[PDB]
Design a protein around this ligand. Structure first.
Ligand SMILES: Nc1nc2c(ncn2[C@@H]2O[C@H](COP(=O)(O)OP(=O)(O)NP(=O)(O)O)[C@@H](O)[C@H]2O)c(=O)[nH]1
Ligand SMILES: NC(=O)[C@@H](Cn1cnc(-c2cc(C(F)(F)F)cc(C(F)(F)F)c2)n1)c1cncnc1
Ligand SMILES: [Cl-]
Ligand SMILES: [Mg+2]
Lengths: 1017, 126, 202
């Protein structure tokens, strides 16, 4: 019964319409979902706009009228110039008439402002289409009608507000360059009249409703109008005094003054500077007397959240930071402005104590701006000495937890390990560190005194707390590098001693975990001090080893990160033999590695072996390094040697899930050490390589055998997943080493040969769900590093992975997402390093290659999209490099227009806007080949065009015909003008892209002006 | 001078877990909640139940007796999960029937869960 | 007490996945584009009693827009969503916000950057500043990892109830009841259907 309004043959029952509308907004459940579908079908009916006047006059529902105007908006924006002139004036009339009617009825104007704003916006859409060329008296008539009434005048400010937004703030990407410049100049020419009306209202007005609307419109004008309207009138006085006292106008006025503040003023004119000083001086005076003094507790006010206090404190912060970042120097030389300068900053100090991360970031951005200037600008920092001192307390007391601290208090009072990384506080910590480092350089004595005294009031318990000891420790760690070595020495010594007292005094598993994490972070942040104090560095490392036995997993996991963090910076002191030591400390670490890492989780053990690898690589005595390496790998190599004896003698131990886990961890240990030793790992790789590749084969047979006996579901079992982990870690170890190898002859002669034999055929002959995308990733590194040395090896890779992988990923854009990405990385590196491998492909396989590239264009996945467009560019270049040879000639004849049309399709379908730049670049290259005559042969068949017609002519005909059928609502002239402009600009990427953007605008509407494509002249 | 739900229940076991429900009309598992799964013993009736709440929202994603009729079966894809049928769970209003699966951080926790689960069934027989 | 919340943002940003996570607890991996809008009641239990959100989860695709801004009428709160792995989605936040505040002139609004669980982040934290001048609350979230997933609704509930100390609380747990050849079929299918994301920490 609700579907009656969808029959347009019979007349439209508005009573039924309002019921469907009410069922959608006020109803629920199924009745709501059914009405929603009906209302969509009604709105999307191309004749629905003819019911517009009917619904607006006779409907007793404002939502029904709103939806009627949405139907008109869509009609005006997309099909206006398709209507006869009769309906264009008729539609204009009952839109203007509806606005007038609603403004004269005070009750309607009061209670239906949503419907009035939608009507105003609909009117503005008409203006964009026909003002001023077909409506030159719109602004004069608007100014006149504003004297006739207050409601009309107020509503006229809304129309002008929306108009300024649509022309200046949102015209780009919604209209052509030509039409945007037309409406900007049209509005600019008639603005002096608009300003008079707006200024007269502001001066004599008393209707808060109309004043706010006028200030709301003024906020939009300040985005583009000449400076003289702002400064050469009395309007800054009005904004900074009158409209700051009343809270009804304060919020919008403060936003108006933030836009003025952001302007870069003529720095030679003394009066502009005087005015810029004055509206600031006035504004801060109104705050102090009408809102709150500079001593007020803004932290408490924000937390209370009365009325709009939180929004006003936000706008205030935005105003103070904008103005001062631009104009504080205007206040720094005049002694009579000094108090104003400091009061403004004192409000900022109070704003920086609010508990609201995003607001704190806004203020912290300004502090960084300030301290960075005081760090370089002569004779400035003494002005802000007191401000900076207060700021040191604010930063230190609001330090966020560093990424390295892995302990945290839960909702039970317990100290525990973190579930997930606090990814949204990484950036905030770096920002606080950056400001606090600057503040420390500006007064290192003051910062030390704040931190030492604060730490002294932690010992005696004056201010002991987990929050307080934490922020303090994090602050101490974050300023590393600002002090002198000698001051840092005395400083750190005192911090450790006081922190070592706390861990004794504060007992309990929770307390001990807090202080332990804080000492770890501080010590780990001062490498310079550890290098110079070997005996302490040694004690630290040994105490970290003790924490590797802590039952508290947070402490334990952090001791492992701290260890490798210290090693990355102090590695050199572990590889040499220190005085009073019988051997380099790396030899003591390795000898007890089983005891030290006994209670660690396997991936923590790997981090430990990687850290040892960092140290071993500092030894440049090849003999000694290789000796250390084999000592480190002694445990995994003894475990390895036993596995090989058992597996090769009886391929049924790998059935044991426990043995699979042991193997995987051995390979993972070799990955960890290889990651940090790189080229120096080769001796260890050679010890396991040939046996490791045999294990890859044996594991592969097991996986296949279990898929055949249990089905595809077997790939989800822990057994098979364990076997594939072995294969993936082996691939990762070979990828990791080849990516850092320095001796590429050994890679070719020793490694690549058996590698390709072990992986390629296994990949090719497995079922899709059993293929490992890591194969593709490994092969990409092989081609990247040595592909230029194994031309026949690259061919073998294509034959094995190209067609079978393409068949996996060419049925949709969703399945096998890992294979999809690595596939196009592989084609990319091959195309730029071994293009010859593609010349050796049979014509049919080279056609799948081209199909594969255009397939990547149509992805929304950015990972494969950008590679698809890059392969296409590089393929074009690889071909033209060949010159006038048969393969290049036949390439263009076969695939040139395919790339042009496929590039065009993704440019214009509104589903691939993310890759517009590279699409445009690719299309520009293609067109420039023809207009430079770099295609040697004709792009057309002998009998489709006169003899001797140039490729330029035929290209313009092919494209004209293509666009004509793809976009039949375009006139022949639009297409011809567009192509003429496009081809003339194939050496100007900026202009070429502009011409494309203008096209994407015009295909969204009817009647686009073809001269718009002459904009670049 | 004048100046200015579970409390009647005992917790027998607690472990962090992720809970799933099997959508038969789609033949896929759909996650239902991640948080702390508790075995709660009523001190008035001595009847043990599972009560699980989602983190942050604290909404109930499991609430039902650990009936002696139930039995924990393994899932083909995991060595740290258990599957079993539940005939009366009131996490979302009226007592619905569900095929649940619950997964844990380690196989060690999954096997401990099974030990405590069976202990509770014995309690719920007396 | 109940409030209408409109959810807007580019297609693919995770609006429907986000709501569905709060409704059922499930994480949808597929991307079925919303057609027009879907209304879902959503209750939260707080110390100030229960609060109901009627979530109007709108479509992001233009071709599936439907009534577009007609969905925004009489909304009392809203969430604007984007995808931190897609720059274009953040570039369009001013367009969505524009269409939203032209209907809803004065309502609490949250800006949400979804999908922070993906490591190759594209919209850096430093770049996200649109919310400052527009008085929007901002949150990094992930419907996949549940990172900050409750923050948008907690903040809105405080702004709508007018209590900054409003907190989510534990809904009381009533005693459950004590209670034939199909449950042997349904269970055998359930065991042989592998659980999703076996590589997750949970
Ligand atoms: N990695 C990751 N993916 C997510 C996350 N949230 C949603 N997705 C995924 O993004 C895709 C689209 O989700 P969807 O909720 O339909 O987006 P939408 O905003 O509702 N699109 P539309 O406007 O067309 O309805 C899904 O595949 C979903 O799995 C997230 O937090 N992390
Ligand atoms: N003394 C105590 O009760 C506590 C105090 N405490 C907590 N952490 C440390 C602690 C921590 C480290 C660290 F570098 F690993 F972080 C180094 C040292 C060192 F070099 F001074 F020895 C002490 N000391 C304690 C706890 N566990 C082992 N040793 C000491
Ligand atoms: Cl998940
Ligand atoms: Mg959706």
């Amino acid at each position: 019964s609700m579907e009656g309004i969808l029959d347009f043959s019979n007349d439209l029952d508005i009573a039924l319409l309002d019921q469907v509308v009410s069922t959608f907004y006020q109803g629920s459940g199924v009745q709501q979902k059914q009405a929603q579908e009906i209302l969509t079908k009604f709105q999307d009916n191309p004749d629905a706009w003819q019911k517009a006047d009917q619904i607006l006059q006779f409907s007793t529902n404002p939502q029904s009228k709103f939806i009627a105007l949405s139907i008109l908006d869509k009609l005006i924006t997309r099909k206006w110039k398709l209507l006869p002139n009769d309906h264009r004036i008729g539609i204009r009339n009952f839109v203007v008439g509806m606005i007038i009617s609603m403004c004269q009825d005070d009750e309607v104007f009061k209670t239906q402002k949503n419907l009035i704003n939608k009507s105003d916006l609909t009117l503005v859409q008409i203006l964009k289409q026909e003002w001023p060329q077909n409506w030159p008296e719109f602004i004069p008539e608007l100014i006149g009608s504003s004297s006739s009434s207050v409601n009309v005048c107020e509503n006229n400010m809304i129309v002008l507000k929306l108009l300024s937004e649509e022309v200046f703030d949102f015209s780009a990407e919604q209209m052509t360059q030509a039409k945007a410049l037309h409406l900007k100049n049209s509005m600019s020419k008639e603005f002096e009249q608009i300003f008079k009306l707006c200024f007269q209202v502001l001066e004599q007005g008393s209707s808060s409703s109309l004043i706010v609307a006028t200030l709301e419109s003024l906020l939009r004008y300040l985005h583009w109008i000449p400076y003289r309207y702002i400064y050469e009138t009395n309007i800054l006085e009005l904004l900074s005094t009158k409209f700051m006292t009343s809270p009804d106008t304060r919020a919008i006025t403060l936003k108006c003054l933030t836009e003025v503040s952001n302007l870069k003023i003529p720095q030679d004119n003394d009066l502009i500077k005087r005015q810029t000083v004055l509206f600031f001086q006035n504004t801060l005076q109104q705050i102090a007397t009408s809102v709150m003094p500079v001593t007020a507790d803004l932290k408490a006010t924000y937390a209370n959240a009365n009325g709009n206090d939180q929004s006003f404190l936000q706008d205030l912060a935005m105003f103070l930071t904008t103005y001062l970042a631009r104009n504080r120097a205007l206040l720094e030389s005049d002694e009579s402005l000094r108090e104003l300068l400091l009061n403004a900053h004192q409000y900022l100090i109070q704003l920086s104590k609010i508990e609201e991360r995003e607001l704190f970031k806004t203020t912290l951005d300004y502090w960084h701006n300030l301290v960075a200037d005081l760090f370089y600008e002569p004779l400035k920092k003494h002005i802000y000495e007191e401000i900076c001192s207060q700021l040191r307390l604010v930063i230190i007391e609001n330090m966020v937890r560093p990424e390295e601290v892995l302990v945290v208090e839960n909702d039970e009072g317990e100290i525990v390990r973190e579930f997930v990384k606090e990814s949204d506080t990484i950036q905030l910590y770096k920002s606080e560190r950056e400001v606090l480092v600057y503040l420390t350089h500006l007064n290192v004595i003051d910062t030390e005194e704040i931190m030492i005294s604060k730490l002294a009031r932690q010992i005696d318990g004056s201010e002991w707390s987990w929050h307080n000891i934490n922020t303090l420790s994090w602050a101490i760690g974050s300023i590393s590098g600002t002090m002198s070595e000698d001051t840092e020495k005395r400083f750190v010594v005192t911090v450790i001693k006081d922190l070592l007292d706390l861990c004794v005094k504060k007992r309990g598993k929770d307390n001990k975990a807090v202080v332990a994490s804080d000492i770890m972070y501080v010590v780990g942040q001062y490498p310079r001090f550890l290098k110079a104090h070997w005996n302490f560095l040694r004690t630290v490392i040994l105490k970290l080893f003790e924490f590797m036995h802590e039952t508290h997993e947070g402490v334990q996991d952090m001791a492992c990160d701290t260890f490798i963090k210290i090693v990355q910076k102090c590695k050199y002191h572990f590889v040499i033999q220190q005085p009073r030591e019988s051997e380099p400390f790396i030899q003591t670490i390795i000898r007890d590695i089983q005891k030290t890492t006994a209670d660690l989780q396997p991936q923590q053990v790997h981090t430990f072996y990687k850290a040892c690898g960092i140290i071993i690589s500092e030894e440049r005595s090849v003999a000694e390094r290789n000796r250390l390496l084999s000592d480190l790998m002694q445990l995994p190599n003894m475990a390895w040697d036993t596995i090989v004896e058992q597996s090769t003698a009886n391929p049924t131990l790998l059935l044991d899930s426990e043995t699979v886990k042991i193997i995987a961890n051995i390979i993972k240990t070799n990955v960890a050490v290889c990651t940090s030793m790189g080229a120096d790992f080769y001796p260890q790789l050679g010890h396991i390589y040939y046996n490791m590749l045999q294990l890859y084969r044996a594991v592969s047979s097991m996986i296949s055998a279990q898929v055949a006996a249990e089905g595809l579901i077997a790939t989800k079992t822990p057994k098979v997943r364990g076997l594939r982990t072995i294969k993936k870690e082996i691939l990762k170890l070979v990828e990791t080493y080849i990516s850092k190898a320095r001796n590429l002859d050994d890679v070719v002669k020793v490694l690549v040969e058996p590698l390709l034999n072990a992986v390629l055929e296994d990949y090719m002959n497995n079922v899709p769900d059993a293929r490992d995308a890591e194969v593709l990733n490994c092969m990409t590194t092989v081609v990247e590093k040595v592909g230029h040395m194994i031309p026949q090896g690259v061919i073998l890779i294509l034959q094995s992975v190209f067609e079978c992988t393409l068949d996996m990923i060419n049925k949709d854009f969703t399945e096998y997402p890992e294979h999809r990405v690595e596939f196009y990385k592989l084609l990319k590196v091959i195309n730029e390093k071994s293009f010859a491998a593609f010349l050796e492909l049979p014509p049919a396989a080279f056609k799948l290659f081209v199909d594969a590239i255009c397939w990547a264009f149509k992805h929304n996945n950015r990972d494969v999209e950008v590679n698809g467009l890059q392969i296409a560019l590089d393929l074009v270049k690889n071909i033209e490099r060949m010159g006038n040879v048969p393969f290049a000639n036949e390439f263009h004849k076969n695939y040139f227009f395919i790339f042009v049309s496929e590039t065009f399709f993704v440019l214009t379908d509104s589903d691939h806007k993310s890759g517009f730049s590279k699409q445009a670049l690719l299309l520009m290259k293609l067109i420039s080949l023809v207009y430079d005559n770099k295609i040697s042969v004709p792009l057309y068949q002998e009998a489709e065009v006169p003899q001797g017609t140039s490729n330029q002519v035929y290209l313009s005909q092919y494209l004209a015909n293509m666009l004509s059928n793809a976009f039949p609502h375009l006139t022949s002239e639009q297409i011809a003008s567009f192509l003429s402009a496009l081809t003339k600009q194939c050496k100007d990427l900026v202009v070429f892209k502009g011409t494309l953007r203008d096209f994407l605008v015009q295909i969204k509407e009817v009647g686009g002006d073809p001269t718009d494509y002459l904009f670049a002249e | 001078f004048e100046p200015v739900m579970e409390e009647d229940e005992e917790v027998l076991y607690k472990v962090r877990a992720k809970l799933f429900r099997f959508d038969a009309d789609a033949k896929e598992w759909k996650e239902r909640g991640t948080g702390d799964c508790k075995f709660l013993k009523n001190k008035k009736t001595n009847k043990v139940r599972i009560l699980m709440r989602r983190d942050k929202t604290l909404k109930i994603c499991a609430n039902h007796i650990i009936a002696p009729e139930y039995t924990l079966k393994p899932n083909v894809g995991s060595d740290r999960s258990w599957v079993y049928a539940c005939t009366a769970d009131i996490a979302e209003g009226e007592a619905e029937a569900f095929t649940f699966a619950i997964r844990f951080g380690s196989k060690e926790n999954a096997d401990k869960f099974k030990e405590e689960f069976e202990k509770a069934q014995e309690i719920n027989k007396k | 007490v109940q409030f209408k919340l409109v959810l807007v943002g580019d297609g693919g940003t995770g609006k429907t996945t986000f709501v569905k996570r709060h409704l059922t607890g499930e994480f949808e991996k597929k991307y079925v584009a919303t057609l027009g809008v879907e209304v879902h009641p959503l209750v939260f239990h707080t110390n100030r009693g229960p609060i109901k959100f009627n979530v109007w989860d709108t479509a992001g695709q233009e071709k599936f827009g439907g009534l577009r801004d007609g969905y925004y009428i009489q909304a009392q709160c809203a969430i604007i969503m984007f995808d931190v792995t897609s720059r274009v989605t953040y570039k369009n936040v001013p367009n969505w916000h524009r269409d939203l505040v032209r209907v809803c002139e004065n309502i609490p609004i949250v800006l949400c950057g979804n999908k922070v669980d993906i490591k190759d982040r594209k919209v850096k934290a430093k770049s996200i500043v649109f919310h400052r001048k527009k008085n929007l609350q901002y949150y990094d979230i992930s419907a996949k990892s549940n990172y900050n997933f409750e923050k948008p609704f907690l903040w809105l509930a405080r702004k709508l109830i007018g209590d900054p100390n409003l907190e989510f609380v534990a809904m009381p747990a009533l005693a459950p009841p004590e209670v034939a050849a199909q449950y042997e079929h349904d269970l055998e299918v359930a065991q042989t259907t592998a659980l999703p994301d076996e590589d997750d920490d949970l």
